[PDB]
Design an enzyme around this catalytic site. Structure first.
Site, short mmCIF file in Angstrom:
data_model
loop_
_atom_site.label_atom_id
_atom_site.label_comp_id
_atom_site.label_asym_id
_atom_site.label_seq_id
_atom_site.Cartn_x
_atom_site.Cartn_y
_atom_site.Cartn_z
N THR B 74 -91.44 -6.95 34.03
CA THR B 74 -90.66 -8.15 33.63
C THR B 74 -91.52 -9.12 32.85
O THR B 74 -91.09 -9.64 31.85
CB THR B 74 -90.19 -8.88 34.90
N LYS B 106 -83.39 4.75 44.29
CA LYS B 106 -82.66 4.02 43.21
C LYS B 106 -83.55 3.80 41.97
O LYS B 106 -84.75 3.51 42.10
CB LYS B 106 -82.06 2.66 43.66
N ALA B 274 -100.70 6.76 37.92
CA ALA B 274 -101.79 5.78 37.85
C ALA B 274 -102.97 6.07 38.86
O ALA B 274 -104.00 5.33 38.91
CB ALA B 274 -101.20 4.37 38.06
N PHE B 382 -90.66 -17.86 42.02
CA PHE B 382 -89.72 -17.38 43.00
C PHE B 382 -89.05 -18.61 43.70
O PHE B 382 -89.76 -19.61 44.03
CB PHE B 382 -90.43 -16.45 43.98
N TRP B 410 -87.64 -13.89 34.27
CA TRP B 410 -86.63 -13.12 34.99
C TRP B 410 -85.26 -13.79 34.83
O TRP B 410 -84.27 -13.18 34.40
CB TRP B 410 -87.03 -12.95 36.47
#
EC number: 6.3.4.3
Lengths: 557, 557, 140
Positions: B74, B106, B274, B382, B410
Site C-alpha cells: 500500500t 483469501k 523472500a 491507523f 490507504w
C-alpha cells in the site's frame, strides 16, 4: 520446390483478428485480444444472437486411422478456404492441441501444407492459457479432496477409493502411479494416485460440453471424486469446490478466434481425448460460429466409428444440433494399408489392395447413413497416388453410392477443395438431413453399448468381465443409468483388437471395465488398457529445441 | 467511511494501457495487449534506451512483520501516486502474487484501499500466464530428468540424490513428500520427491534475475538437478533442457504493464520467495522502468533484514543498480507488539511499549545506513493511534536521524502520500546515496553468513550442524564458494527464533542445512523448517467462492 | 529372507550384476497372515538406505524355499536347487539366480537342521513323520 509447414505458417500474411471479428459483426467490446493475431470471443455474441438463424453444420470425420495418415484436419481447413473463395460466410472450428507433444515427438500445424490455422507456434504452446486453466481447476479439486481428508474426513471418504487423479500437460510417465501424502500427521494422508495428461481431464470434457459458465459450474458440482467407507458417492458438489473451479475457468470458457492462412476465420477451443471422451471441440465454439456464419465446418477425433458417433450421440444430442452434411476423409495410402499393405510398400500402387481396403470406408459411409446425415467423401490426394488408383476409389464411392470429390488442399490451398466445396453445397441445397441420435437415453447401459457395437462397429455382440458387470450394476443403481455411453477402445479397428484392419466380421467386443464421468455426463466402457499419460521417447524433441538471440526457434516442428 | 478493497478496485476507472505505454515513449509494436488493461512490453525498449540515464531508484521495505500488519505494498503504490501528483514522471515495480493463497487464506489487493494496482482480479489469478510458464519450464526439466533414468541413465545419475523437485501453484500439503515412478519397468524409476509451490521454483528466481532471454537460457543450463553415483554434479545443460525451458519462457521474460487506481503506470513481473530466494520483482521490469521514468519505486519481501538486504546484495549487485533512497514502513501497533503488547490489546495507548518496540525500527534504520542509502520512515496511519503515540514515534525517528512522515494512502490515495513523497524528494535532493553491497563475493561462505548475521541481524555468531558443514565443504570444492548467500530464516524476528520480537541480543543463529541454486547463482543456508509448500486451512476460501450468471464473484476477497 | 536381503544389498553395493530392480520376482516371507505386507515399497530414506523398489511378503509356507525343502533328496541337493532360483533379470532381460549372488551356501547352512524329518506319533502311538508344508496351488 521444398516447402515445410512452419515456413508456410511464417510466410502467411495474417490479418488483425480484430477486423476478422468486426466483419462477422462481433462488436469491439466482445473481443479480448491476446496480441494482434489471437483473441477471445465473449459468450454474449451467442447470448445476443440467441434467436438468429443457425447457419449450416458440416461435420468432418474420417476413415479408420492408420500409420499412413489421412489428413482429416488439413482437408477440414481446406474445405473452409474453398467455401470462402466461393464467397460464403464460413468459419472452421478446431480442437486445441496439448502442449506435451511439442517436447516429445514434435509439434505440428493445425491442418497441414496450405490448409493451416495460424499462428502455429502459439497454438502448439500456451496459446491463450485454456489448458492451464483446466489444469488448475482439476488440481484444485484434488488439493481440496486431500485437504478434506487431512482436516478430519467429515465426509468419511475412503482414500483408497478416490478416482479423482491430478493432471499436468507434459508427457511424464514417472507420474502415472505415485504415492502421495507421506511424511507424517503434518503432511497429509498417504494414498496411491497418479497424473494424467491435462487434455484427458474430465474438466476438459466439461469445458467442451458446457453451454455457459453456469452450466460448467453445475457439471463440476456433479463430479464424483470417490466413495465413503459405506459406498456412497462423494462429489465435487459435496466439497463445495465448483465455485472456485468455475472462477478458474472464467476466461477459458470463451472461444479463441484465430485464422486460416487465407485469413478465413477460425475458432480453436477445447481439446478432449477421443476414447475416454468425445473428441470434439467445444459446444460453445460451434454454436457461436453457428449464429455467426452460414456455414460452420467442424471435426471429431479418430475415425468415423468413434469421433462421428460421439459427435452425433453426445455433442449434437446435448447441443440440440442437427448436422446437415458430413464429410468422410480418406486417402488411397490409408485404404491400401486397410487392404493389408505394409507402410514401407505404399510407394507402389496396388489396385487390388485399394479394392480390399475400401471396405473400411464403405462401412463408415453406411454408418453415417444410420444417423440421417447426408455423407460426402473426400479423397486426400498425394504425390504417389496414381490416377488408376484415384479413379478406382472414386468410382468405388460412386458404385458405393455417395457423393465424392478429390482434394488437393494440402498443396493448392482453398482452390484444391473448390470441387469438394461445390459437392457439399450441392448436397446442402438438394439433400436435407433427417438427423437422429443412434439410441435413446432410456435404454439400459448394456442396451446402449449393444446398439453401438452392433450397428456401428458391426460386432456380433458384447461380452463383459465380472467387474464390468459389477460396475454397471453399481452405476444403474446409483442413478447414472440414463447417460450417453462413451466407448473407450482402440481407434485402429472397428473391433477392439487393433490388428484387425479393413472391415472385420465375426468378431465380438469385450468390456473389461466401466468408468463414470458424472460432470461430463457420460458412462465410459473400456475395452483395453487406455493410455492417459503418454511418455517421452528415447531422444525427445526437447533436447534439440533451441531459441536464439533473435527469437528464431529451431527443433520445434 | 472507506469502501472495501474489492469494491474500490471495481469502481476504478482504468486507462487503456496502450495509452499509458505511448505516454512513456514505448512504441506500439513494443507492446502486446492482453485485453485493454494489461500488456507485455518488449525487451527492445530497454535495448534501444540502454544508453539513456537511469531515474532515481527508491526501495520500499518494512520493520519486522508482526500479526498487527505494517502495510508495505500500500505504501509503495501510494508513494508512487503521490509522486505522480507532485508532477514526477514515476513508475512502481511490483511482484506477481501466487495463485494459491486466493484459495486458502483469501487473495487481496496489490496494495490496499485507495492504493492498489489494477486489474486486481487478473493479477491474483492467471494474469498474463507467467507463473504457468514457470511451472512448465520447471516440470519439463523434472520430466526430462525422469525420462533420462528411464532411457538407460547414460549420465549415471543416482536417482536418490536428485534435488530438482516439481511445482504447482496451489497450496497442496499432500504433494510435499511423495514417491513416483511406480508400476514396473514400463513406468519409470521409483524415487522419493515432492512438489513445491511454483513461486518457490528456482526457475522463478532465474526469471527475476535474468538480464534477457539468452541470459535466462544460460542460467537454466547451470541448474544442478542431482549427482552421479560418483558424486559429480549433473546440470540441466548436461540434459540439454535449457532451450526448451527458454522456449517455454519466451513470453514470460517480458514485464507486464498495468497501473494504479490513479492511472500511474506499474510493472508487475516475477514473484519469488523472500527466504530461499531474494524476494524481489524482476531485474527486467526494474531496469526498463529506470529508463522509462525519472523515479522508480520498488519493494522487497519480508522486513528489511531479509528483503532489503537481498535487494541490495543480490538484485542490485547483479544489475549494477545504486539505490537512491529507501522507505521503511512501520506502524504504531506493530511496534507495540515488538515492545511486548499482545495482539488483543494493541488499541490501548502504551507509550512505554512503543518506546521499547521502536528498537526494532531503530535497528532497521541503522541497517539501511550500512549500505550507504539514506532512509525515510513511513508511518501507516491507523484509527486507534493516539496523538501522543504518533508524536513520540516522530521524536524517536528524528533522534535516530531519519526523516519520517505519516502516510494515509490507504484512506486518501496519493493525497495521503504527499508528505512522504516530499520527504523522499528532499532526501533525493540533499543526501545522494553512496551505495555499496555489504560483502565481497570472494569471502568464504561462512564469512559471508557471519557478516550478514552479525551486522544485519545483530547475532553474536553462527553455529553449523554437521550436515551444514559438509554441504558447505562440498559446494566450496565444487567451485560455488564465490556466490552471494541467501539466508532462509524466519521473517518474524531478527533472530532465527520467531518468538524473539523487538531487537533481541545475546543470540546465535544456527544454520541447519545449506542448499544450492546454481542457475539463480546463489547459496541458500537454512535456519528452521522452511515451508516451500504451504497447506490449505480447515476452511479454505475455496469453499466460499462463487461466481454467478452475471460473472459476479463473491467469497474471493 | 536372507536371499532377499542379499538381492537388496547387491543393488546397494553398486549393482555389479546389473539387475533391473523392477523385474525382481523374489519377494519376502513371514508366517503370519498380514494383508498389509502384500504390496509395499521398500529401500526409502535416501542413498544410505537402499534402492527404492516395489515388492511384498508372502506367507512363509508359500515360499519356493519351502517347495525346495519338500522336493530335495538331501542337503547338497537342496543347496543346488537354491543356486538355481531365479530372483529377477538384468536390464538386458537375462535371468539372475541365487547362484550368481552366491547365496546358496548360506541358505543351505540355515536349513541344516530343517532338512531332517521330524518323528512324532499318533494318539495310539503309531510313528509319524511331519516335514515340510507347501501350498497346493502354486506348489505341489
Amino acid at each position: 520446390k521444398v516447402p515445410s509447414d512452419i515456413e508456410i505458417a511464417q510466410a502467411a500474411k495474417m490479418k488483425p483478428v480484430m477486423e476478422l471479428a468486426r466483419g462477422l459483426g462481433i462488436q469491439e467490446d466482445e473481443v479480448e485480444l491476446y496480441g494482434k493475431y489471437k483473441a477471445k470471443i465473449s459468450l454474449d455474441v451467442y447470448r445476443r444472437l440467441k434467436d438468429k438463424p443457425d447457419g449450416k453444420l458440416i461435420l468432418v470425420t474420417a476413415i479408420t486411422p492408420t500409420p499412413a495418415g489421412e489428413g482429416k484436419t488439413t482437408t477440414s481447413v481446406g474445405l473452409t478456404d474453398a467455401l470462402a473463395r466461393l464467397g460464403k460466410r464460413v468459419m472452421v472450428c478446431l480442437r486445441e492441441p496439448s502442449l506435451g507433444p511439442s517436447f516429445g515427438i514434435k509439434g505440428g500445424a493445425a491442418g497441414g501444407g496450405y490448409a493451416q490455422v495460424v499462428p502455429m507456434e502459439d497454438i502448439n504452446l500456451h496459446f491463450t492459457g485454456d489448458i492451464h486453466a483446466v489444469t488448475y481447476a482439476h488440481n484444485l479439486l484434488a488439493a481440496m479432496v486431500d485437504n478434506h481428508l487431512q482436516q478430519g474426513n467429515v465426509l468419511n471418504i475412503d482414500p483408497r477409493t478416490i478416482t479423482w487423479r491430478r493432471v499436468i500437460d507434459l508427457n511424464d510417465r514417472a507420474l502415472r502411479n505415485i504415492v502421495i501424502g507421506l511424511g507424517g500427521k503434518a503432511n497429509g494422508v498417504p494414498r496411491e494416485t497418479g497424473f494424467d495428461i491435462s487434455v484427458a481431464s474430465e474438466v476438459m470434457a466439461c469445458l467442451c460440453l458446457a453451454s455457459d459458465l453456469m452450466d460448467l459450474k453445475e457439471r463440476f458440482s456433479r463430479i464424483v471424486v470417490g466413495y465413503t467407507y459405506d459406498g456412497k458417492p462423494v462429489t465435487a458438489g459435496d466439497l463445495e469446490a465448483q465455485g472456485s473451479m468455475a472462477l478458474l475457468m472464467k476466461d477459458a470458457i470463451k472461444p479463441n478466434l484465430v485464422q486460416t492462412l487465407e485469413n478465413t476465420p477460425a475458432f480453436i477451443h477445447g481439446g478432449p481425448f477421443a476414447n475416454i471422451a468425445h473428441g470434439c471441440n467445444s459446444i460453445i465454439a460451434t454454436k457461436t460460429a453457428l449464429k455467426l456464419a452460414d456455414y460452420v465446418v467442424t471435426e471429431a477425433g479418430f475415425g468415423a466409428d468413434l469421433g462421428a458417433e460421439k459427435f452425433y450421440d453426445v455433442k449434437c444430442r446435448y447441443a440440440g444440433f442437427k448436422p446437415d452434411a458430413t464429410v468422410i476423409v480418406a486417402t488411397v495410402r490409408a485404404l491400401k494399408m486397410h487392404g493389408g499393405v505394409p507402410k514401407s510398400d505404399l510407394a507402389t500402387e496396388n489396385l487390388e489392395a485399394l479394392r480390399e481396403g475400401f471396405a473400411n470406408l464403405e462401412k463408415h459411409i453406411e454408418n453415417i447413413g444410420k444417423f440421417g446425415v447426408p455423407a460426402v467423401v473426400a479423397i486426400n490426394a498425394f504425390p504417389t497416388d496414381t490416377e488408376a488408383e484415384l479413379n478406382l476409389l472414386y468410382e468405388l464411392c460412386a458404385k458405393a453410392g455417395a457423393e465424392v470429390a478429390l482434394s488437393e488442399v494440402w498443396a493448392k490451398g482453398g482452390e484444391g477443395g473448390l470441387e469438394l466445396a461445390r459437392k457439399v453445397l450441392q448436397t446442402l441445397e438438394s439433400r436435407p438431413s433427417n438427423f437422429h441420435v443412434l439410441y435413446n437415453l432410456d435404454l439400459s447401459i448394456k442396451d446402449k453399448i449393444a446398439k453401438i457395437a452392433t450397428e456401428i462397429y458391426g460386432a456380433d455382440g458384447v461380452n463383459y468381465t465380472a467387474e464390468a458387470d459389477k460396475a454397471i450394476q453399481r452405476y444403474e443403481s446409483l442413478g447414472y443409468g440414463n447417460l450417453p455411453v462413451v466407448m473407450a477402445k482402440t481407434q485402429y479397428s472397428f473391433s477392439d483388437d487393433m490388428t484387425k484392419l479393413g472391415r472385420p466380421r465375426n468378431f465380438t467386443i469385450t468390456v473389461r471395465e466401466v468408468r463414470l464421468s458424472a460432470g461430463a455426463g457420460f458412462i465410459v466402457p473400456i475395452t483395453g488398457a487406455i493410455m492417459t499419460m503418454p511418455g517421452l521417447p528415447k531422444r525427445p524433441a526437447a533436447c534439440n529445441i533451441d531459441i536464439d538471440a533473435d527469437g528464431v526457434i529451431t527443433g520445434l516442428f
